[PDB]
Amino acid sequence: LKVIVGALIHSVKKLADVTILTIFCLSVFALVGLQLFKGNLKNKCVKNDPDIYINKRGTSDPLLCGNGSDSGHCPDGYICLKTSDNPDFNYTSFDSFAWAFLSLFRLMTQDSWERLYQQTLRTSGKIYMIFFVLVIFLGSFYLVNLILAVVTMAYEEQNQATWVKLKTILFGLVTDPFAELTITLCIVVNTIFMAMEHHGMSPTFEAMLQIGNIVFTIFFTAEMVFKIIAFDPYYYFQKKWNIFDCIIVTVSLLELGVAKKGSLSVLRSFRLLRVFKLAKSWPTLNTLIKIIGNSVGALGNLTIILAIIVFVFALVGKQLLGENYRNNRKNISAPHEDWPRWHMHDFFHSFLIVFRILCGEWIENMWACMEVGQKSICLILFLTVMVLGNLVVLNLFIALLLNSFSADVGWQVRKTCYRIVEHSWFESFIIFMILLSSGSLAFEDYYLDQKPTVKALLEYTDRVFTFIFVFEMLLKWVAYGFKKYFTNAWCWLDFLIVNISLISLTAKILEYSEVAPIKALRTLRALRPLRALSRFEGMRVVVDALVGAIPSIMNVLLVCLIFWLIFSIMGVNLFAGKFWRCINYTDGEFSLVPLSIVNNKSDCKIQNSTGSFFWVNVKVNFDNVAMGYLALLQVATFKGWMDIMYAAVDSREVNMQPKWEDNVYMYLYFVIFIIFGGFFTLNLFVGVIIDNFNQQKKKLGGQDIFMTEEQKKYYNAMKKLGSKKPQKPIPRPLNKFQGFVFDIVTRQAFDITIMVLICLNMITMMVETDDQSEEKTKILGKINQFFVAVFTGECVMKMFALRQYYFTNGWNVFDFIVVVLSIASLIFSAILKSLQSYFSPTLFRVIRLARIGRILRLIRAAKGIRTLLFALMMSLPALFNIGLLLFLVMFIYSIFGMSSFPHVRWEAGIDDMFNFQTFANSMLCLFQITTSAGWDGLLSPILNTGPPYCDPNLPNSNGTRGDCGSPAVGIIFFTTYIIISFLIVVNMYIAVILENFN
Numbered sequence: 001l002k003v004i005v006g007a008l009i010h011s012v013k014k015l016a017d018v019t020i021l022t023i024f025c026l027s028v029f030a031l032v033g034l035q036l037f038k039g040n041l042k043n044k045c046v047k048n049d050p051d052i053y054i055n056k057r058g059t060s061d062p063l064l065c066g067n068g069s070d071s072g073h074c075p076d077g078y079i080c081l082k083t084s085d086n087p088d089f090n091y092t093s094f095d096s097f098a099w100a101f102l103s104l105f106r107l108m109t110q111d112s113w114e115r116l117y118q119q120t121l122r123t124s125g126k127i128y129m130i131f132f133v134l135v136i137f138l139g140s141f142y143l144v145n146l147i148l149a150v151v152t153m154a155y156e157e158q159n160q161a162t163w164v165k166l167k168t169i170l171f172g173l174v175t176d177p178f179a180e181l182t183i184t185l186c187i188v189v190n191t192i193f194m195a196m197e198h199h200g201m202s203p204t205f206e207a208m209l210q211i212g213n214i215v216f217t218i219f220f221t222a223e224m225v226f227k228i229i230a231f232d233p234y235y236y237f238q239k240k241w242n243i244f245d246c247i248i249v250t251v252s253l254l255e256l257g258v259a260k261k262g263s264l265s266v267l268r269s270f271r272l273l274r275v276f277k278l279a280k281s282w283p284t285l286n287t288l289i290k291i292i293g294n295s296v297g298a299l300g301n302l303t304i305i306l307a308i309i310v311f312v313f314a315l316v317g318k319q320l321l322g323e324n325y326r327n328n329r330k331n332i333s334a335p336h337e338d339w340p341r342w343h344m345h346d347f348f349h350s351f352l353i354v355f356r357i358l359c360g361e362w363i364e365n366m367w368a369c370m371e372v373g374q375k376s377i378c379l380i381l382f383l384t385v386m387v388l389g390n391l392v393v394l395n396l397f398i399a400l401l402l403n404s405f406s407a408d409v410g411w412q413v414r415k416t417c418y419r420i421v422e423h424s425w426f427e428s429f430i431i432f433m434i435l436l437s438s439g440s441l442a443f444e445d446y447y448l449d450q451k452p453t454v455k456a457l458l459e460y461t462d463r464v465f466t467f468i469f470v471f472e473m474l475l476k477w478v479a480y481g482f483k484k485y486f487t488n489a490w491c492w493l494d495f496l497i498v499n500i501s502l503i504s505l506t507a508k509i510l511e512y513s514e515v516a517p518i519k520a521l522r523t524l525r526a527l528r529p530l531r532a533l534s535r536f537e538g539m540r541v542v543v544d545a546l547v548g549a550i551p552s553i554m555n556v557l558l559v560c561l562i563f564w565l566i567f568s569i570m571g572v573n574l575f576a577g578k579f580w581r582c583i584n585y586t587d588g589e590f591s592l593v594p595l596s597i598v599n600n601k602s603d604c605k606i607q608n609s610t611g612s613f614f615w616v617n618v619k620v621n622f623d624n625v626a627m628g629y630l631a632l633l634q635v636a637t638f639k640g641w642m643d644i645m646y647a648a649v650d651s652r653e654v655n656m657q658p659k660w661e662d663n664v665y666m667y668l669y670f671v672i673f674i675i676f677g678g679f680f681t682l683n684l685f686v687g688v689i690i691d692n693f694n695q696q697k698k699k700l701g702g703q704d705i706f707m708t709e710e711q712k713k714y715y716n717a718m719k720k721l722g723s724k725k726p727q728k729p730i731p732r733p734l735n736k737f738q739g740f741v742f743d744i745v746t747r748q749a750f751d752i753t754i755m756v757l758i759c760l761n762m763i764t765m766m767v768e769t770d771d772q773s774e775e776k777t778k779i780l781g782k783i784n785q786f787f788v789a790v791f792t793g794e795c796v797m798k799m800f801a802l803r804q805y806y807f808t809n810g811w812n813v814f815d816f817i818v819v820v821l822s823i824a825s826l827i828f829s830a831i832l833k834s835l836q837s838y839f840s841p842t843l844f845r846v847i848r849l850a851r852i853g854r855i856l857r858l859i860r861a862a863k864g865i866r867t868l869l870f871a872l873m874m875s876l877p878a879l880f881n882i883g884l885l886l887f888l889v890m891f892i893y894s895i896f897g898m899s900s901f902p903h904v905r906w907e908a909g910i911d912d913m914f915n916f917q918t919f920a921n922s923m924l925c926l927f928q929i930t931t932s933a934g935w936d937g938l939l940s941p942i943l944n945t946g947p948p949y950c951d952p953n954l955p956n957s958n959g960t961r962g963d964c965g966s967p968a969v970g971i972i973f974f975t976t977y978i979i980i981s982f983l984i985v986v987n988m989y990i991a992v993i994l995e996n997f998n
């Protein structure tokens with residue numbers, strides 16, 4: 001309505017600066033991509049002596065090539081020509097500016113950016129990960145922070161603007177506080193009783209569990225009867241807690257009366273909502289329930305707005321694409337499924353599509369839509385859903401976030417070592433030694449076997465490092481008292497790490513050097529580079545800030561763990577052991593045998609003529625509550641989410657072959673789990689951390705946290721450099737000719753002319769295209785010469801108009817640097833094109849990029865972009881500390897992975913490039929998952945258990961008998977990685993937000 005359009009106009013006015021920054025930064029990075037990797041994602045592997053392309057293991061699209069020393073290779077008998085198609089429906093390469101903009105929008109929204117990351121590093125070269133790191137940090141974090149801050153401030157400004165019965169009663173009225181404690185004990189034990197539901201529970205276990213359920217239903221019924229007789233029912237009403245318990249008990253007894261095995265497992269688990277009764281001695285659970293209530297209560301208007309928006313988008317998508325999806329389904333349909341797992345044909349699946357968009361995965365369905373129907377309709381619909389969809393969601397996540405959180409010889413002997421240790425020389429020696437030790441544990445990799453000298457040198461240096469660190473601890477002991485030394489947290493960590501190293505080294509010589517405990521002990525050497533958190537003041541202050549919030553993290557962690565236990569129990573009840581299928585694993589790719597041939601384990605055993613019918617289960621299932629937790633986490637991070645939705649919907653009943661969309665309506669379980677365990681237990685984690693820092697800062701004096709004392713004054717000086725200090729220039733300097741040029745320069749024409757010159761040098765290098773004609777190349781290359789000459793001449797006339805001692809007058813030094821860079825690029829291109837033109841052709845495009853300075857020159861004109869960049873400049877030291885810590889933890893887990901998974905089957909997620917064998921590869925993978933992208937894909941080849949998936953008979957990997965994973969450690973590793981990184985990055989968002997708040 002008119003009110004809505006007026007509010008939108010006001011918001012865009014408030015969103016103008018951030019929108020302009022987004023468009024400009026996206027354009028700059030699009031130009032960088034279009035001038036770096038245009039025409040690289042076309043190197044389909046092809047045969048040589050013809051026109052058929054190999055496929056990547058378990059893939060339908062062709063493999064990709066690159067000639068770079070560190071790009072994707074190709075199998076023998078194949079050659080790497082370029083082909084007119086791009087890997088993913090001819091839509092995932094940025095050669096034209098349109099594709100560059102789209103791919104950089106994908107990188108910003110971090111939606112399936114894993115795919116582009118792997119493709120581009122496979123076709124271009126591993127060294128280009130720098131572009132993706134830079135774009136992820138700048139814009140995927142930066143621009144999201146700024147847009148979320150803008151909406152925050154918009155909301156803030158909106159707020160600113162706006163007798164046997166007598167004996168029974170006597171016995172019953174006790175209501176002693178010991179009765180409630182017994183009830184709570186009975187709830188807890190009942191829950192932990194039902195938390196032993198597993199697929200292969202024996203009949204005795206089933207009997208025991210149903211007996212327990214009967215006992216507890218009886219006990220609840222008896223307590224309800226006591227309560228109703230304790231006082232007359234007329235007063236029982238007006239008690240929400242009591243009526244909730246009444247309804248749940250009624251459902252429990254109704255299910256008990258049911259004699260069909262509790263066919264509705266949902267009803268079976270309806271009792272489990274009792275844990276909410278436990279929200280009386282816990283304040284965090286009460287706050288969570290209050291969050292949900294405000295969502296459904298005071299702030300229900302926004303929620304209904306979100307629901308109506310999603311319903312409208314789903315219905316429109318169906319009405320406009322169902323028939324096309326049905327007719328051309330074969331186009332997007334899997335090779336064997338004969339159908340698209342997602343489509344618009346039915347309201348349910350259109351809603352699921354819209355929900356996946358809101359979840360933040362849009363490109364897959366985007367390609368499907370825009371290769372099955374009109375491009376215009378798909379283009380507008382998917383993008384308009386992304387913007388409006390994720391805008392409304394973030395409005396909830398904050399509106400709820402604020403609503404809920406607005407309320408003697410010995411003396412001299414000791415002094416000897418004391419003054420020795422205090423020596424700055426020794427302090428620097430030790431810090432450098434720690435850094436060298438951290439570096440040393442990086443080349444111990446899968447390939448270290450083939451270089452005997454390197455490993456011998458590495459073990460020698462580790463031994464010497466152990467000895468020197470033992471000496472250092474001896475000096476520490478001598479200098480400081482035992483009590484003082486042991487009462488220090490950091491001293492404890494340095495004690496444990498040296499203990500681990502010493503015991504590992506002793507075990508090297510001693511026996512028992514192969515058992516699993518000692519193997520794990522030596523695996524813990526990856527904590528060795530954790531000694532550098534006290535040495536560095538930035539890391540130390542960050543660690544103190546984090547440890548300050550440990551209790552506030554733990555409270556919400558436990559509340560969320562209980563909520564996830566509830567959901568895992570429901571999931572186990574619903575899908576205990578139905579995630580089993582008979583497959584066709586002949587060589588590499590596999591397919592579910594059709595129901596015609598095999599219908600159940602019996603068939604899969606008798607129809608096994610070829611020997612290629614295996615009966616195996618999904619990697620992550622709902623057998624146990626542990627696997628319930630793991631699968632719930634995968635659905636919560638939105639990675640691996642799909643393989644489980646597929647298995648859940650397909651499964652029919654124990655020991656039966658899954659059928660396509662048998663239980664098509666079991667998507668609702670995952671929709672509900674997201675909506676409740678993913679978004680409502682994150683509005684409670686954020687809230688707690690912001691209410692923790694809001695106070696912790698207030699307590700420490702309100703001084704900016706994360707910044708060392710030394711850097712505090714450097715930041716003070718910088719913000720002092722960001723002040724108001726203008727000097728009036730001198731007219732007609734020196735000779736009148738200088739005055740003549742100066743008077744015209746002063747006018748408000750030179751600025752605008754250079755600016756419109758910089759815009760026409762942007763739109764002359766954006767019109768470039770990979771398949772451009774040679775005449776087009778000629779004209780644009782000459783326009784480039786004209787522009788560089790114009791800029792150099794118009795930069796040297798102003799220079800003369802201001803003598804030669806005006807470098808420090810202002811930002812003109814940047815203009816001088818960029819113009820000299822452009823001239824240098826011109827001359828170097830001229831040299832290479834003729835003199836020594838035999839170098840690699842990549843350098844031509846690398847250097848040709850140096851013309852981006854003429855784009856960076858537009859900053860000084862844009863006040864909003866300049867202010868936001870200044871905010872980044874101010875935040876840079878704190879972000880440097882946090883990034884140091886994050887790279888440190890990334891290093892720790894890099895060494896862990898390098899030691900753990902150097903032998904694994906290269907299933908979807910792990911291939912030759914993105915394995916864990918090399919340090920750089922492992923670093924690539926860990927950086928990938930730091931954003932929580934593709935961690936499921938990297939996890940799947942670790943859950944492999946025996947054939948057919950893995951080959952535990954393989955000669956290699958003596959630890960596991962073959963290239964089979966170890967899920968016990970593989971789940972801990974990735975769960976801890978995606979939790980720790982979330983913490984660090986959520987403290988990196990807080991820092992940026994508080995800096996921009998100043």
Ligand SMILES: *[C@@H]1O[C@H](CO)[C@@H](O[C@@H]2O[C@H](CO)[C@@H](O[C@@H]3O[C@H](CO)[C@@H](O)[C@H](O)[C@@H]3O)[C@H](O)[C@H]2NC(C)=O)[C@H](O)[C@H]1NC(C)=O
Binds near residue numbers: 602603
């Ligand atoms: C797995 O599913 C298949 C398909 O539903 C089941 O196949 C059917 O099983 C029944 C019972 O064994 C068979 O019935 C008998 O068939 C013989 C002839 O083969 C007939 O002489 C008997 O009077 C009786 O009708 C039925 O034929 C069979 N159908 C097919 C197509 O094979 C199978 O039993 C299931 N396995 C298990 C263990 O549940």
Ligand SMILES: CCCCCCCCCCCCCCCCCCOC[C@@H](O)COP(=O)(O)OCC[N+](C)(C)C
Binds near residue numbers: 490543
């Ligand atoms: C090495 C094992 C691997 C995992 C290590 C943990 C991961 C690294 C990050 C966490 C570091 C944990 C240790 C540092 C904790 C913060 C530091 C906690 O403060 C304790 C002392 O450092 C302070 O000095 P004192 O205790 O001697 O005197 C003050 C007395 N009060 C005030 C404490 C009572």
Ligand SMILES: CC(C)CCC[C@@H](C)[C@H]1CC[C@H]2[C@@H]3CC=C4C[C@@H](O)CC[C@]4(C)[C@H]3CC[C@]12C
Binds near residue numbers: 486487488489492496
């Ligand atoms: C596997 C074995 C060797 C691990 C032993 C680790 C123990 C001894 C360490 C790990 C972390 C340590 C704590 C870290 C921080 C502090 C605060 C400070 O006031 C000293 C005591 C106290 C509370 C430490 C006590 C000892 C402690 C709990």
Ligand SMILES: CC(C)CCC[C@@H](C)[C@H]1CC[C@H]2[C@@H]3CC=C4C[C@@H](O)CC[C@]4(C)[C@H]3CC[C@]12C
Binds near residue numbers: 095098763
């Ligand atoms: C200066 C003229 C073009 C009018 C103003 C529009 C300018 C600023 C920009 C806006 C969007 C731009 C287009 C966006 C993308 C592409 C695809 C690329 O492969 C060739 C150039 C082309 C087609 C651009 C031409 C210039 C363009 C039209």
Ligand SMILES: CC(C)CCC[C@@H](C)[C@H]1CC[C@H]2[C@@H]3CC=C4C[C@@H](O)CC[C@]4(C)[C@H]3CC[C@]12C
Binds near residue numbers: 402986
């Ligand atoms: C409303 C203002 C005036 C008060 C302060 C509120 C601050 C603390 C709020 C408003 C915006 C919030 C952010 C919104 C979204 C995200 C992204 C999420 O992945 C982690 C939490 C994080 C980074 C939030 C942290 C807390 C936050 C910065």
